[PDB]
Design a protein around this ligand. Sequence first.
Ligand SMILES: COc1ccc(Nc2cc(C(F)(F)F)ccc2Cl)c(C(=O)O)c1
Ligand SMILES: [Mg+2]
Length: 452
Amino acid sequence: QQSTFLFHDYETFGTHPALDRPAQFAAIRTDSEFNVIGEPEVFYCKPADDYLPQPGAVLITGITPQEARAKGENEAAFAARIHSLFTVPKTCILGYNNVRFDDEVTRNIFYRNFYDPYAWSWQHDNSRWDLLDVMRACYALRPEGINWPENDDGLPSFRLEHLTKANGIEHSDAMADVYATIAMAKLVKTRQPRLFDYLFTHRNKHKLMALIDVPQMKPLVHVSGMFGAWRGNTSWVAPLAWHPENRNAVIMVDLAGDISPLLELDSDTLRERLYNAAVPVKLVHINKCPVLAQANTLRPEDADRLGINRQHCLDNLKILRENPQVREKVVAIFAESDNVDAQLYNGFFSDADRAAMKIVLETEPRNLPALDITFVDKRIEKLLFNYRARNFPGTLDYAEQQRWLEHRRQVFTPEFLQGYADELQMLVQQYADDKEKVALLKALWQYADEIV
Ligand SMILES: COc1ccc(Nc2cc(C(F)(F)F)ccc2Cl)c(C(=O)O)c1
Ligand SMILES: [Mg+2]
């Protein structure tokens, strides 16, 4: 079996990866050298009748709820198709902003439809990557040979459409974003070969672990969206401690920051603060392909370009090393909704509960009503009801139908429905000169009228 890349992208009906619903999934498989070896995989997800899309999302995607409903399969089948692609052995699953967005959509789709939300990304030698932080790393660390567009605010832009246009890459077609992401990968591989190889290799958590030296507070360069485009998303950081609960999270200090709150304030004040002096502390999640490298990877000329003050960072590093009591202080900081759709991270399920959920998954939907099985975790009863009612409404008995009707009633409150009508009317005035958007908004009104 050969190593492959699976490039993918979602179009969704809103910004919330848990509370909004997916509309469309697109993917294609390449070999290890980015040669396309698969057929385009494009399919839609039917939205259940307890949901209205965010109008803004539909204006961006151009996909109406009517179209996803008419072309889609139920979310159970949508999940099955995605799971089948993602679990082919030796697959690197990647996209553009997938770590923060698409992967969270995936986890939630799997969660709602009785798949393991996590196993897909690591089992059978699988992995994840994300070209967004690769582009950011290039801009900060090795900008030579790539054109770096500025947005309307005068800051470097990493929007996929800006980067393609700025570098002469054809960008238009449900597959447009996927092909654009492949082109980004080829771009960096060709123009910054050693950085590309370094970043690919260091997608693996164990390679990242080797860079981390807590006793020595060994400084690293870290490229992260959280740092801000104004400094090329980059700083020098040092590891203080590992997270008390989260096995994959290390606690970093931003050496370019103001460490005085860490020196002066107690752990209780600092916990309230990061939830007035800024607390220069962040978590780095080693399972989320963070960009980390030895400190000298950021060259002086580039530190100067990004406005990063080396002496300030060195002074802070010296102070922190002479005050190891700050380690316990940050550990103490991190020592620390009734909608089941929002409860993915309310904990892991027991081995027994997962085994039972696996039976739900592998049982014929028609045999679910009579399915004898036991759950402990309180989420599962509601997950199972929603699953059946949304995907297989023809299998509900009268009491279950009445339960679903009440559920819908509690979503479509008086405040929600008025707000929705108000937003559509506002948007049709705002975008009156845009004929495509006007037509989409009329479609949204018509869908809302039906789904009520
Ligand atoms: C013994 O502790 C140190 C101290 C400084 C180091 N390097 C370094 C440190 C910084 C810092 F300013 F961020 F601290 C910037 C750039 C570099 Cl190359 C390094 C290092 O690069 O390994 C180790
Ligand atoms: Mg996307």
